[PDB]
Design a protein around this nucleic acid. Structure first.
Ligand SMILES: Nc1ncnc2c1ncn2[C@@H]1O[C@H](COP(=O)(O)OP(=O)(O)OP(=O)(O)O)[C@@H](O)[C@H]1O
Ligand SMILES: [Mg+2]
Lengths: 201, 86
DNA sequence: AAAAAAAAA
């Protein structure tokens, strides 16, 4: 209730938290069941705050940032057990978030290499690890919400949408909904949001 | 301290964000640098409108005297369309 | 096995 505006963003969040049913076929393999939402906008437009709210209100979710994560350790890791002395897999960031939702900040600022992990997971909702003699397919049917800022400091309305976003088209095509948010200067809305924020504090 | 006033007046500066609403104000009525009549308050100043002003007779309206102004604010420009002065 | 710093292409 403390976020002014963003009505349809809230509606999309509500539809995402309780998304559609998964369809499986004996011949059609697998059909994706949830919805992913991506947001891009100029700074200070309440994206991280809404993401934190979604994290707090969700039944199961994991917090992740683009710069402070590595794709190899984000899915599965190989470590040795102290008792037995053998090596066994450790679940990654989104494996723990199976059937949950994963929220990522600074999505555009993440290293390009790690992005392939998302390219692996969001494709078929299954991550396959093959390293040091371990062969297993791990299930991960999580939904991913991300927020990234454009290449320039502020969004350019007069420019091509493709050149405003640093991410490649391959991953952008997977996300169902693209939302662009800008803080247009308007004295009426400035007064309204100012009195609202002063009410909050 | 007046008995009648217990309606409330509003500072000039708080007129910036709203429009199409009537208000009561008071301040130094004088001429700005450009040459128009304006109201000055410890908060700010605005432009006035006189073309449809009905005064309270029996008063010498001279620049430099505090006057109670009633009218509607408009944000198309910065014109406070006055309807009465007392 | 996996993270982080350095010189050279
Ligand atoms: N509509 C709004 N209602 C209330 N607060 C808002 C609104 N829009 C922005 N804010 C405020 O903007 C501030 C900036 O917060 P935050 O950094 O999370 O936003 P952001 O848009 O996600 O920024 P960034 O792109 O830098 O991560 C917050 O303190 C938040 O309260
Ligand atoms: Mg933020």
């Amino acid at each position: 209730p403390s976020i002014y505006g963003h009505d349809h963003i809230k509606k999309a969040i509500l539809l995402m938290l309780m998304g559609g049913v998964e369809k499986n076929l004996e011949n059609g393999s697998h059909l994706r069941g949830d919805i992913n939402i991506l947001m891009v906008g100029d700074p200070s437009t309440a994206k991280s705050q809404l993401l934190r709210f979604v994290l707090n209100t969700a039944s199961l979710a994991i917090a992740t940032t683009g710069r402070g994560s590595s794709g190899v350790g984000l899915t599965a890791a190989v470590t040795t057990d102290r008792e037995t002395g053998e090596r066994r897999l450790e679940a990654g960031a989104m494996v723990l978030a199976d059937r949950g939702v994963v929220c990522i900040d600074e999505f555009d600022k993440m290293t390009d290499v790690d992005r392939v992990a998302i390219h692996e997971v969001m494709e078929q909702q299954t991550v396959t690890i093959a390293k040091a003699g371990i062969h297993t397919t791990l299930n991960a049917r999580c939904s991913v919400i991300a927020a990234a800022n454009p290449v320039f400091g502020q969004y350019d309305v007069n420019r091509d949408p493709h050149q405003n976003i640093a991410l490649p088209d391959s991953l952008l095509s997977r996300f169902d909904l693209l939302f662009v948010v800008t803080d247009d200067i308007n004295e009426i809305r400035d007064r309204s949001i100012s009195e609202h924020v002063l009410r909050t504090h | 301290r007046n008995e009648n006033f217990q309606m409330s007046i509003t500072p000039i500066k708080n007129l910036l964000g709203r429009d199409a609403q009537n208000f009561l104000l008071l301040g130094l009525l004088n001429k700005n640098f450009k040459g128009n009549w304006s109201l000055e308050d410890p908060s700010g100043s605005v432009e006035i409108d006189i073309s449809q002003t009905i005064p309270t007779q029996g008063h010498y309206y001279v620049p430099g005297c505090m006057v109670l102004v009633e009218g509607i604010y408009y944000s198309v420009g910065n014109k406070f369309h006055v309807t009465s002065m007392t």
